[PDB]
Design a protein around this ligand. Structure first.
Ligand code: AIO
Ligand code: AIO
Lengths: 659, 659
């Protein structure tokens, strides 16, 4: 992004993209918005079924399903205005959605055959009882709360009772009188919500619940249906997050059938992906697992027997793309070439050697065709803005677009972590018009938390580094330990001790900066958002002689006030780890603020609740220290859209005023 | 304040004060804390009855009534920990208070005679139904909600149904999860709360309500009992606030008896004081009124006939102190000598000439003895820090304490208002070490709203001006039109047009500043709190070429979000005055912010709700302008106590950084 070839994707055996008013098909044909409009009763659509080229069009009056290969309307759907929770049946003729707390199924209507009223699956949804939506704070790969069986006979869905969770107020300041709504945000160490899984059987209109049993707090993750629809598999994770049991439940009655396998960890287990069945098989599936230190693909049968670890090595699978039609090969993205890069690979289901299908050094983003016969590859590197190719697998490529190259120079390299052994990768955005004779102020842009990696081999953070460098400030970033795509041992060093290693590694970044002659060692600043706001603030309080100025956005300040699921994975529960929580609790060290720090929060932030930065200002008042503040009353966790211009101006002016 | 002679006051025919461990009596005797302690079953006390020297002591285990003239314990009271709402019977042997939403009366227990359970006057108090407390947002002189009859036979009290008022959330951020409480703050133009007056008769335990009738929104103010306890008088003010009817109600049945008199005004009527009966009379009383342009004392009889305007002139009575024993003279404080000064006077009840009893130029604060025979006077002026005298009236004074005089020079003078006719008084705090050869930045400290007057002839704002001047910044203040103690016409020019005249007068202040050679006209700032925060912000947006930097604390930003009672008096209702509200609505002009402005708010401010400054930051985001912010999460409208040091440091550093 930015997208040079709009909507580039597979439809049947054609790759497809938009060109203003046309939709262009190739294996060439065009389809105009006028051609299309004539068929209604180039616009935006959601692809439902790439293999069959079925999409849905969001229009003036409900949804219009459309077949792009046949060039024919499929169904019109009426979801009473609901679009966010839309989940279409794999059969393509029904859609589940949530409206006013309850789960519904709507049936599509064929062109001029009249409509039917939607079915209410649930009727007692409310504030404290949530149906059909993501649960467990969207941890464990959970992004939604509806799971159609693969032949469309059944709809599994979450039911979340959060009546035992003490809510946080989220205040809307726009009405005449401000209006508060409870957010049922379960904080570390507190009673969790109670999720159960229902299955609604369309033929009979019966609902059964899985008998997942006790404890009621157990995390029910990665729902995966058997291809024959008889079993619903669930990866269940305990409160300690050190055990994951993959269990089979009977879809008809809800009864527990068997435990397939159990994974455990010294620190935490974290399942993130569903079971994926082999093509044409009801008995074998791929499961992703980081159990050996590295995310890899495992071949299981459905009794729970492990056939083979299919991928292996000191590198990680970062996206599983699927199979060849016969199910004899796996396709996937990984870090095998470099953790700074992403390539697409093939491997035999029997394992052994990977074959890189996108060998150019840099970042490949790749889409395997419904065939399993070809790929779209989108490529960028420090020297290549965008290279979009289409390859018939092992039959030569065809380039579809290639982009050609005063701006800030970007330098990259490696420094040693604080253990003196682990290498860390860094990027350094140099002042515009950099003159090596001169001294320059510099800003550490830090994130440093799990699941993110900021330094990759890409077409050279959303460009805040560039803007700052245009103002004469170098910006440095290093992926310290805790960060992603470097295997588990590299990440899990932070367990029970948030901030400690991360800061020690960032101070290696500062040691490097200070080795540079052109760095003004007395003008070093720090900026980050979220976990990076936690880090910015911790760094100013911990290394006040070094960091003169920071801006911390949406910062975690007190981890006891972060959510149970993410928080307790990396930190354990507060009652189990008082020493670690206390060391990371920035409220306790507010008196050590001696530089200039601005905190920024969205007022309606439901991720890092506003309370975090407010209590920090409060602690500073008592401690007699002097931070600055800005609040975005209409924003949540991140400032999004045009208002991001105001954000960038506020942050950079703070630095140009004070650093 | 600071208090040089601690607790200085009348007790019987003695004036009294504390000296560490003694309470010293004079007309000399001492009473030690050890003498006192021996009598319990020099400390802090509340005087209940100065004439009889009866006080109450707040102790470890309930309240102890004590007679200071007799040196004997009166009663012990058990009010289950409640102290804020305490209202003692004039008989001295019972106390009303509010606990858990309900009104109670407790009977005092004589030393070693055992206690009795308190009487519950009400039992259905809750969140939306308030008993025994101030109502109508404490406007109209209302400071409490209990009114004992003067012989203690009855207790009148307010009942406020606020179930029709849409509340504002007030959030406590200190618990693990933040906790919101509704504040039933009725905003301009919205449905007001419904107040009725109950009277509880102690002999029978019966409660009757006054039949105050419709509209239910009417303001019931300045409750005043007849000395014979048969009638309860109420000053009733309509929603428009341009009519006040003083009505008599039968205390026994609640029935309406008669309207005594009606006052009306072109702009607003504002009754602020109770009826005060002549000594020994049930038929004549003094009523304060600003009806002729100036606050004066009127002599009425109880049918409603006006006997005489007793005081008159182009000056205002600022405190009515009472009568001589015979009720032939009035004692009171006024502005007759100068609006910049306060003197104590005598006048014949027949009127005519005032006699100044405290003729020295400056500020006198005066207490008339229970006799009506003598005064304590506390005096300060620009040259006199503190002069404390005691005069036997018209029989020569006795001085009791006289205080003796690098610091910022304070200059004072007069400039013309923007009409070119009305004089305005100003004070100017000069930089420390002021050098007339030099140029200095200067800050307008502005308040500018009704009911306040910042420039008086005093021992030279809580000293923020001095601190700023120590940092090299001159501070200027001018009492613009709208401000207090200059009669109604001077105030009421702002009616329906908040900010407009006030700003035009403050810009005369700036014209004066710019006439000074030692003023750096390019380094002019502005600071104020509350109405002064409204003014600071309006000035920056209205005169952005002049005011480079401001700090606005607890600012009103949108008057539609200010309370019905204060707001609609000066502005009328929003539906009646859209042009005036729109002109004062700072949200509409956020795009005109071109200087540096910090807003500061207490998060739990129940006067100017936090929403005001938050919506201003929000409007600035949209408008692309760049204010700064600080929030005090544990503070209400003003930052109080030691945290005020943090406040002063934040505000002054903002100026030293940017102005
Ligand atoms: B942030 O860094 O954006 C925020 C605070 C620390 C972790 N975090 C997250 O947003 C994580 N998500 C969740 O906590 C979800 C909402 N449970 C991110 C980084 C994904 C792991
Ligand atoms: B402030 O100036 O402290 C605030 C905003 C404008 C008026 N105001 C007040 O505090 C007034 N009191 C009330 O509004 C009461 C609470 N109804 C003061 C100035 C007394 C008139």
């Amino acid at each position: 992004y930015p997208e040079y070839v709009v909507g580039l994707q597979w439809m049947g055996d054609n790759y497809v993209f938009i060109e203003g008013d046309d939709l262009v098909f190739n294996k060439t044909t065009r389809f105009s918005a006028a051609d299309l409009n004539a068929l209604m009763p180039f616009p935006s659509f959601r692809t439902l079924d790439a293999g069959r080229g079925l999409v849905v069009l969001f229009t003036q009056g409900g949804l219009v399903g459309f077949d792009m290969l046949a060039r024919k309307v499929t169904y019109l759907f009426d979801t009473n205005e609901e679009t966010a929770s839309l989940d279409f049946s794999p059969v393509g003729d029904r859609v589940a959605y949530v409206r006013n707390h309850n789960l519904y199924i709507a049936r599509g209507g064929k062109l001029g055959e009249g409509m039917s009223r939607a079915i209410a699956v649930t009727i007692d949804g409310t504030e404290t009882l949530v149906y059909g939506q993501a649960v467990h704070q969207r941890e464990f790969g959970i992004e939604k709360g509806t799971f159609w069986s693969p032949k469309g006979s059944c709809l599994a869905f979450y039911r979340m009772d959060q009546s035992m969770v003490k809510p946080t107020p989220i205040v809307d300041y726009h009405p005449l009188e401000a209006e508060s709504k409870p957010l049922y945000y379960p904080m570390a160490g507190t009673p969790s919500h109670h999720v159960t899984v229902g299955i609604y059987h369309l033929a009979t209109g019966k609902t059964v619940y899985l008998q997942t049993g006790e404890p009621k707090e157990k995390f029910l993750t990665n729902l995966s249906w058997s291809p024959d629809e008889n079993i619903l598999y669930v990866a269940e994770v305990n409160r300690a997050q050190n055990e994951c049991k993959v269990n089979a439940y009977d879809a008809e009655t809800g009864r527990f059938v068997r435990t397939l396998f159990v994974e455990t960890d010294k620190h935490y287990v974290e399942p993130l992906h569903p079971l994926t069945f082999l093509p044409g098989s009801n008995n074998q599936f791929i499961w992703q697992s980081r159990r050996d230190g590295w995310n890899h693909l495992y071949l299981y049968d459905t009794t729970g027997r492990l056939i083979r670890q299919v991928t292996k090595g000191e590198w990680e699978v970062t996206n599983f793309a699927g199979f060849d039609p016969k199910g004899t090969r796996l396709y996937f993205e990984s870090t095998e070439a470099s953790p700074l890069e992403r390539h697409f690979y093939c491997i035999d289901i029997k394992g052994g050697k990977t074959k890189d299908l996108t060998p150019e050094s840099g970042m490949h983003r790749t889409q395997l065709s419904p065939d399993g016969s070809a790929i779209i590859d989108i490529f960028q590197s420090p020297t290549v803005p965008r290279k979009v190719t289409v390859t018939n697998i092992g039959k030569g490529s065809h380039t579809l677009l290639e982009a050609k190259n005063a701006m800030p120079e970007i330098r990259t390299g490696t420094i040693m972590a604080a253990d003196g052994q682990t290498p860390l990768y860094y990027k350094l955005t140099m002042p515009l018009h950099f003159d090596p004779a001169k001294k320059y102020p510099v800003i550490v842009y830090v994130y440093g938390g799990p699941h993110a990696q900021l330094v990759t081999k890409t077409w050279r953070v959303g460009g805040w580094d560039i803007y700052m460098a245009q103002k004469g400030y170098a910006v440095f970033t290093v992926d310290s330990r805790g960060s992603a795509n470097r295997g588990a041992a590299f990440e899990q060093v932070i367990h029970r001790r948030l901030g400690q290693t991360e800061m020690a590694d960032q101070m290696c970044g500062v040691d490097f900066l200070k080795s540079q002659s052109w760095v003004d060692a007395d003008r070093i600043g720090v900026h980050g958002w979220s976990y990076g706001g936690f880090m910015t603030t911790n760094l100013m309080l911990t290394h006040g002689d070094v960091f003169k100025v920071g801006v911390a956005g949406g910062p975690v300040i007190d981890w006891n006030r972060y959510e149970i699921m993410y928080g307790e994975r990396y930190f354990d529960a507060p009652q189990e780890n008082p020493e670690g929580y206390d060391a990371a609790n920035l409220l306790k060290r507010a008196g050590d603020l001696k530089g200039r720090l601005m905190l920024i929060h969205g007022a309606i932030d439901p991720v890092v609740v506003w309370q975090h930065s407010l209590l920090f200002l409060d602690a500073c008042v008592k401690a007699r220290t002097y931070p600055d503040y800005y609040v975005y009353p209409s924003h949540e966790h991140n400032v999004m859209g045009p208002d991001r211009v105001h954000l960038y101006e506020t942050i950079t002016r703070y630095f140009t005023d004070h650093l």
